[PDB]
Structures are given as C-alpha cells and as structure tokens.
Amino acid sequence: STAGKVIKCKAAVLWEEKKPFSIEEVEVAPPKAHEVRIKMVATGICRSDDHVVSGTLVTPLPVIAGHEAAGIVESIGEGVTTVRPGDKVIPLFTPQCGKCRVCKHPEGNFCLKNDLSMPRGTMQDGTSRFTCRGKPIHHFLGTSTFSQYTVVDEISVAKIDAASPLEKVCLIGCGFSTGYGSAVKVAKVTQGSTCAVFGLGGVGLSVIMGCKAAGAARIIGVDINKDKFAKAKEVGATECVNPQDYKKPIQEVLTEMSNGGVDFSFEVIGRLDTMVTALSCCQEAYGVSVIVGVPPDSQNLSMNPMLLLSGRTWKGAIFGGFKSKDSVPKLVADFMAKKFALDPLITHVLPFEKINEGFDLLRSGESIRTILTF
Amino acid sequence: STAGKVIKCKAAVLWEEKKPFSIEEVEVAPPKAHEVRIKMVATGICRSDDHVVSGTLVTPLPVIAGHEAAGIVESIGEGVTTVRPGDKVIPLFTPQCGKCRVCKHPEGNFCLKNDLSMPRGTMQDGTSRFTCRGKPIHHFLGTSTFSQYTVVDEISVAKIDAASPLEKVCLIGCGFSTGYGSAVKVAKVTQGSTCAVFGLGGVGLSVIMGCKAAGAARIIGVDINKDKFAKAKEVGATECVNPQDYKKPIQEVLTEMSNGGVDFSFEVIGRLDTMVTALSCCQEAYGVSVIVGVPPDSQNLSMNPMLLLSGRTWKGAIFGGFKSKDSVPKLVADFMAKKFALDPLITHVLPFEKINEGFDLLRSGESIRTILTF
Ligand SMILES: c1cnc2c(c1)ccc1cccnc12
Ligand SMILES: c1cnc2c(c1)ccc1cccnc12
Numbered sequence: 001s002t003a004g005k006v007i008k009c010k011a012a013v014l015w016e017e018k019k020p021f022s023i024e025e026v027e028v029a030p031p032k033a034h035e036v037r038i039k040m041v042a043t044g045i046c047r048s049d050d051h052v053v054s055g056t057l058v059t060p061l062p063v064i065a066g067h068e069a070a071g072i073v074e075s076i077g078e079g080v081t082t083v084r085p086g087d088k089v090i091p092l093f094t095p096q097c098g099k100c101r102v103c104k105h106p107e108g109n110f111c112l113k114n115d116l117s118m119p120r121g122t123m124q125d126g127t128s129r130f131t132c133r134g135k136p137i138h139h140f141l142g143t144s145t146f147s148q149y150t151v152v153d154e155i156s157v158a159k160i161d162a163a164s165p166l167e168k169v170c171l172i173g174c175g176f177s178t179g180y181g182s183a184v185k186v187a188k189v190t191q192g193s194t195c196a197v198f199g200l201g202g203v204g205l206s207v208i209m210g211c212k213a214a215g216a217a218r219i220i221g222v223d224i225n226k227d228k229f230a231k232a233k234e235v236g237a238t239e240c241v242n243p244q245d246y247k248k249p250i251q252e253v254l255t256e257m258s259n260g261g262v263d264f265s266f267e268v269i270g271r272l273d274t275m276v277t278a279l280s281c282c283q284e285a286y287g288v289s290v291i292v293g294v295p296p297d298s299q300n301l302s303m304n305p306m307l308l309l310s311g312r313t314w315k316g317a318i319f320g321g322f323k324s325k326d327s328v329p330k331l332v333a334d335f336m337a338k339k340f341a342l343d344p345l346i347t348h349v350l351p352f353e354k355i356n357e358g359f360d361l362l363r364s365g366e367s368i369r370t371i372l373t374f
Numbered sequence: 375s376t377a378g379k380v381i382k383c384k385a386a387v388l389w390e391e392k393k394p395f396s397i398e399e400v401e402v403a404p405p406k407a408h409e410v411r412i413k414m415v416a417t418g419i420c421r422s423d424d425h426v427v428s429g430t431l432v433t434p435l436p437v438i439a440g441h442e443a444a445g446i447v448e449s450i451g452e453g454v455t456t457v458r459p460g461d462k463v464i465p466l467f468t469p470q471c472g473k474c475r476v477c478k479h480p481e482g483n484f485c486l487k488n489d490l491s492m493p494r495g496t497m498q499d500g501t502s503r504f505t506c507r508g509k510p511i512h513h514f515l516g517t518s519t520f521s522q523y524t525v526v527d528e529i530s531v532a533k534i535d536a537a538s539p540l541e542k543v544c545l546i547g548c549g550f551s552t553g554y555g556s557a558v559k560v561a562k563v564t565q566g567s568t569c570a571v572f573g574l575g576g577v578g579l580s581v582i583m584g585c586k587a588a589g590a591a592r593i594i595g596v597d598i599n600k601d602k603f604a605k606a607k608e609v610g611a612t613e614c615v616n617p618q619d620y621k622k623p624i625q626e627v628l629t630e631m632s633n634g635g636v637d638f639s640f641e642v643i644g645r646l647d648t649m650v651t652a653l654s655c656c657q658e659a660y661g662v663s664v665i666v667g668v669p670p671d672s673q674n675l676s677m678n679p680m681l682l683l684s685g686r687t688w689k690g691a692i693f694g695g696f697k698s699k700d701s702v703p704k705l706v707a708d709f710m711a712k713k714f715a716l717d718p719l720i721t722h723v724l725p726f727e728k729i730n731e732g733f734d735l736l737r738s739g740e741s742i743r744t745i746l747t748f
C-alpha cells in the first residue's frame with residue numbers, strides 16, 4: 001500500500017559543507033525499472049560519510065549521505081530479480097554489475113559502475129529519487145542510507161539471511177568488510193604470520209579480526225591512543241605499541257620486534273607518514289603492506305622505491321577487495337554461523353535523529369562505531 | 375694442477391670511482407672450505423657494474439666488479455658438494471643459502487646472505503681472495519666476474535648443462551633472468567593480458583620475452599629512442615610507443631590504448647617519473663606494476679596513494695624474483711630446450727681486455743648487451 005507511490009519520510013540532509021545534518025521531511029520516489037526501495041533499519045557512521053561533510057570527499061550537494069546500512073525491501077521496480085519485498089538487504093556502496101571487465105576479473109571488485117571515482121550523486125540512470133519540498137537532493141555512492149527510505153539500483157543491493165539482526169550486520173556494508181577483507185582477501189594473511197596494524201578504530205579492529213581468522217601467530221596493534229589497546233587485544237591483537245613511548249622511529253622498533261620485518265602490514269588511519277612506515281616495517285624480501293584508509297586529502301606521499309626493489313608488495317583496495325554482491329551474503333552467513341563477532345565494534349547506539357551527536361562521537365574519537373536505528 | 379695454489383692472472387680492477395678499469399696482474403687465492411674457484415669464460419657488462427664506477431652503487435674500493443658471467447670450475451675447497459672441477463657454472467650475485475627466513479619463504483629470493491644491502495666486498499667469511507702487488511682487493515656481490523679467475527662461496531654458484539654455450543648463457547647471471555623473471559615470476563603475467571614495458575634495452579627486451587612466454591596478447595614497448603623498436607617487436611612487442619611523439623601524458627595514451635588501463639606494467643629504466651607513470655597506466659582495480667631498475671640514486675618519488683586504494687598492486691624484485699640456485703640451472707635447461715633465444719640481446723662481443731670499450735658502449739646506449747670473452 002506504499003508500492004508504486006511516493007513515500008514521505010524523514011532524512012538527514014546535508015545542504016552545505018561543514019554544516020550539521022538537518023532532519024528534513026523528504027519525498028522518496030518509487031523504484032523505476034531495476035531499482036529497489038528499502039526501509040532502513042540501521043546505518044553506521046563511517047569516516048567517509050564525515051569526509052563528505054568536510055569537502056574531503058567531493059560529491060554533489062545537497063546530498064543524503066550514508067553508505068553502511070541494512071534494511072528491509074518495501075518494493076521492487078520492474079525487472080528486479082534478486083530481492084523481493086520483505087527481504088533483508090544490505091546496500092552495496094561498491095556495486096557488482098557482473099558485466100564490466102572488473103566484475104569479470106577474478107581479483108577486481110571496484111566495479112566500473114561505481115559513483116566513487118567521479119561522483120554524479122544520482123541513480124545509475126543519472127536521476128534522483130529524492131526531493132525535499134520539491135528541491136532535488138543528490139544520492140551518495142548509490143546507497144544514501146541516512147534516510148528512513150532509500151532507492152538503490154539493483155546492482156547496488158544484496159539479499160542477506162532473513163534471520164539476521166540488522167542493527168549488527170549493517171557493519172558488513174562497510175567498516176567490518178573493509179578491514180576484514182583487507183586481511184583475508186587483499187593481503188591474504190597466512191597461518192603463522194606476523195601482522196602489524198596501524199590504526200585501532202573500528203576498521204583496524206576488523207583487520208585484526210581478519211588476521212586472527214587467517215591464523216596469524218602475531219598481530220601487532222599500533223596506535224598513539226593507548227585507550228584503544230584493550231579492545232584490540234580482546235579481538236585478537238597479541239601486542240600493542242604506542243609510538244609516543246619510543247625514542248626511535250617506529251618501523252625500526254617493529255623491524256626489531258619481528259626479527260627483521262613483519263609479514264603483513266596494514267595502514268588503517270589514512271596518514272601519509274604511517275603509510276611509508278607501514279611499508280617499511282614489512283620484511284624487505286616478501287613483505288606485503290596494504291592501504292585501507294583515505295588520507296585528509298590529496299597530496300603525495302614521498303617514498304624511496306628501493307623499499308619495493310628488494311621484494312616488497314604495496315597495494316590497496318576498496319571494500320576489502322570483496323566482489324560486493326557475491327560476498328556480503330556469505331559474510332552475513334558466516335556471522336550467523338558464528339565464525340566472527342560484531343558486538344566488539346559497536347560502542348554507541350543512537351536513534352537516527354541524533355545523527356549529529358553520532359558524528360561528534362566519531363570526530364572526537366570517543367566512538368569505535370555508532371549505529372543509528374530507525 | 376693449480377689446485378691448492380695461488381693463481382696469477384689478469385683482472386679488471388677499479389681502484390677509485392669515476393676512473394676507468396685497470397687491467398692488472400692479480401693473485402687469486404685457492405678456495406677455502408665451502409668455496410669454488412672458477413675460470414671465467416664470459417661476462418656481460420650490466421648497468422649495476424657501471425653504478426659501481428659512478429659511486430651510485432656504494433661498495434668498498436678497490437674492487438673487482440662483474441656479476442653476470444659463466445665459466446668452468448678449476449677447483450673446490452673442502453665441503454663443496456654441489457659442483458666439481460670441470461663443471462660449467464654461473465655465479466649467483468644473489469645467493470641461495472637455503473637456510474635463512476628468506477630462502478625458506480616460498481616467495482622470497484633476496485637471500486639474507488647477500489652482499490647488496492650492506493656491502494662488505496668480501497667472501498662470506500669476511501675475507502678477500504684477491505691481491506694486487508700484495509694489496510687486498512675487494513670482491514663484489516660475492517661474484518667478481520671481471521677476472522680470469524674468481525673465488526665464490528658455494529651458496530653463490532650453480533652447475534649448468536655441460537653443453538651450454540657460455541658466451542650466451544652468461545646473460546642468465548643477471549640481465550636476462552632479471553627481465554624475464556620480472557614478467558614470469560614477479561608479475562605472473564597471464565594469457566590474453568595487455569603489458570606495457572618502459573625501457574627497451576636488454577633487460578626490457580627480456581621482460582618482453584617473458585610477457586610472450588606467459589602468453590600476453592598485447593605487449594606495448596615504450597621508449598624515447600625509436601631505434602630500439604625493431605628489436606622490441608622482433609622479440610615479441612606488438613606495438614611501440616615513443617612518448618615524445620605525443621602531446622598528452624603517456625599514461626593517458628596507454629590507458630586509452632588499453633581501454634582503461636593495462637594488466638601489467640614494468641619500469642625497466644630506473645627513473646622516478648616513469649615509475650609513477652608505469653603504476654598509473656595499469657588498470658585501477660586489478661593492475662600490477664613491477665619495478666625492475668635502480669634509480670640514478672636515492673631521491674624519493676612523489677606519488678598519490680589513491681593510485682593504490684582502487685586496487686593497484688606495486689612491487690619490485692632482484693634477479694627477477696628467482697630463487698637463484700634452484701632457478702639458474704632450469705633457465706639454461708630451457709635455453710638448451712630452445713624455449714627462448716638469447717642472441718637478439720647480444721649486440722657486441724669484445725675480448726676481456728677491451729672492458730673499457732664495453733662500458734663506453736653501455737654508457738652511450740649503442741649496446742643492448744656486450745659480452746666480454748676471456
Ligand atoms: C567509500 C566509502 N567508504 C570508504 C571508502 C570509500 C574508502 C576507504 C574507506 C576506509 C575505511 C572505511 N570506509 C571507507
Ligand atoms: C645487483 C646486480 N644487478 C642488478 C641489481 C643489483 C639491481 C637491479 C638491477 C636491474 C637490472 C639489471 N641488473 C640489476
């Protein structure tokens with residue numbers, strides 16, 4: 001009885017940069033062909049959502065942001081074959097069209113239909129399904145999860161276990177999948193290995209979890225905030241190191257600790273200096289360093305390529321290297337089959353309308369993950 | 375007959391940097407425990423030998439350089455189990471001790487016993503087997519091939535097919551294996567793939583031969599010297615590009631030519647600008663870019679880490695990523711089996727005593743590869 005009609009609901013609109021989100025009444029158009037309308041149940045607050053606020057992630061405004069979420073299908077446009085009204089679903093901020101050279105590639109996952117490279121802030125057909133008092137509002141990464149209802153292209157949604165707790169599995173829409181995949185899928189951490197993780201927020205913890213799932217012998221957490229350590233240890237970290245405690249450069253400390261360099265290093269914080277450090281502390285002949293985080297923005301790092309000529313590998317990925325529509329449901333199935341825990345990452349839960357408070361907790365560092373409930 | 379005794383012979387001694395090599399009468403001590411004295415039959419002139427001349431590659435002087443060679447064992451010290459007097463051998467500038475964390479690693483080849491990282495210019499025991507007028511002369515990379523006779527540690531030598539033409543296979547000691555391995559072993563070039571090779575001197579052509587051995591559909595040669603193109607095409611290149619013919623940046627041209635980026639790219643000339651270019655032109659989601667050459671010395675490159683966050687892999691290696699003692703014999707086996715040709719690389723052949731002439735040909739760029747014959 002809302003199918004095929006406009007829905008009136010609340011969303012969190014960013015009218016301008018460096019402003020709070022504004023709770024507005026919006027009109028959400030019904031789904032056109034190959035589009036899916038979703039009732040949001042929960043959405044996480046991610047660093048990249050805050051980058052939209054600070055102009056760091058350039059995307060058209062005004063916008064409904066949000067990209068880490070889970071909800072329930074309310075209706076499907078014509079042609080949709082992969083989800084039905086009633087299904088529990090996760091929006092995919094990286095799509096899997098299944099047709100482009102990337103989706104066809106055994107390794108690649110950055111589907112060329114993404115809206116991240118050159119953001120249009122629209123549906124795939126170049127239009128928006130959102131208005132706020134007749135004014136068009138842009139989409140974000142084809143997801144736009146800071147709304148009671150959103151419409152997504154079918155390539156940007158996956159059906160998940162009908163019995164999953166959406167307030168938890170929403171993490172699989174970004175933060176968890178991104179860290180966990182980095183270890184398990186991008187670095188392909190091996191049993192017995194020594195790992196180093198730079199950044200112990202939610203994505204870092206997710207990397208640690210992946211390293212533990214992979215059977216790593218040592219997982220060295222690195223952060224200047226020592227209050228992040230207990231939780232890191234709790235999810236699998238063997239040791240934690242605070243660089244401010246040391247007189248000598250941190251890769252030197254990590255090289256000594258690992259008897260000549262770690263097997264896998266991960267930079268989660270998104271900082272140009274720790275990126276080079278992280279490459280450097282991995283073992284010169286067969287070390288792997290993986291980039292996870294976006295920097296505060298643009299600007300080159302400076303780096304000596306002899307770090308690579310000995311044998312090091314340097315790489316990065318989006319969404320932990322996972323092909324989005326194939327992987328998300330199995331990640332959920334694994335969580336349901338108890339192969340990993342999500343509770344440790346969730347430190348704050350708030351009603352959707354206290355969104356701005358949620359961003360305050362992110363910006364101050366007090367939160368690991370805030371989930372907003374609808 | 376000379377076994378257990380000092381041999382008087384000639385060598386090319388570099389007494390000082392930026393000097394020409396000096397043909398001197400030297401004394402070559404007999405091999406101690408686990409050492410092997412070799413009569414040299416051929417040695418190539420490699421770019422890294424010239425880096426020793428310019429003070430670019432810092433190693434103790436005075437020195438006997440040379441590291442790409444083949445010859446015959448004239449005697450063995452006690453313990454030597456892997457070669458016998460009379461065996462055709464290739465010295466291994468990257469050793470394979472078989473015992474360190476690296477030789478144990480199924481991907482590493484940069485054996486920790488190497489003398490490249492922190493050059494001592496000695497045998498493994500911290501001594502020299504070379505004197506000139508009683509004065510000690512340093513070794514180089516445990517190989518010192520610019521001598522009628524050398525002594526090397528057993529870890530730095532490999533027995534090869536007794537019917538090998540040593541004037542040809544000597545290229546397996548560095549230049550060929552380095553390029554070819556970069557394609558075959560380091561990048562793991564795949565069938566149907568599109569490859570770009572920056573620099574078409576000898577090591578670049580060896581990359582091209584590797585890409586073709588791996589079954590690439592497209593091999594794009596890139597050099598500012600168009601005179602290098604015919605040989606490039608002759609060993610497997612499908613097209614050649616000279617950046618100076620173009621008005622736009624060469625990675626744009628290569629991205630457009632490859633419909634959105636190459637699968638595998640290789641920087642073979644060792645320049646910082648081409649490194650970034652090479653990386654950039656590879657496909658953003660699953661592209662792999664391999665660094666083969668040593669910069670003109672230090673200088674950091676400047677690079678935007680967003681190039682990696684989309685999914686790019688950036689890596690380097692020494693000696694084409696080959697475990698040296700295991701691999702050198704099989705490469706000769708394959709050459710003997712006619713699985714690849716070495717003649718297209720051999721552009722000049724000179725007697726050992728014209729060493730300086732050979733370096734002039736290298737430095738001017740008239741040579742692909744000069745082989746010196748004893
Ligand atoms: C779009 C959305 N979220 C992300 C990115 C891009 C890139 C990096 C990243 C790292 C951690 C958490 N989320 C993101
Ligand atoms: C020792 C000897 N030869 C080399 C190196 C080190 C490093 C790089 C390289 C690249 C091309 C050819 N030779 C070498």
Ligand SMILES: [Zn+2]
Nearest residue numbers: 097100103111
């Ligand atoms: Zn796709």
Ligand SMILES: [Zn+2]
Nearest residue numbers: 046048174175
């Ligand atoms: Zn995110």
Ligand SMILES: [Zn+2]
Nearest residue numbers: 471474477485
């Ligand atoms: Zn070793």
Ligand SMILES: [Zn+2]
Nearest residue numbers: 420422548549
């Ligand atoms: Zn060499």
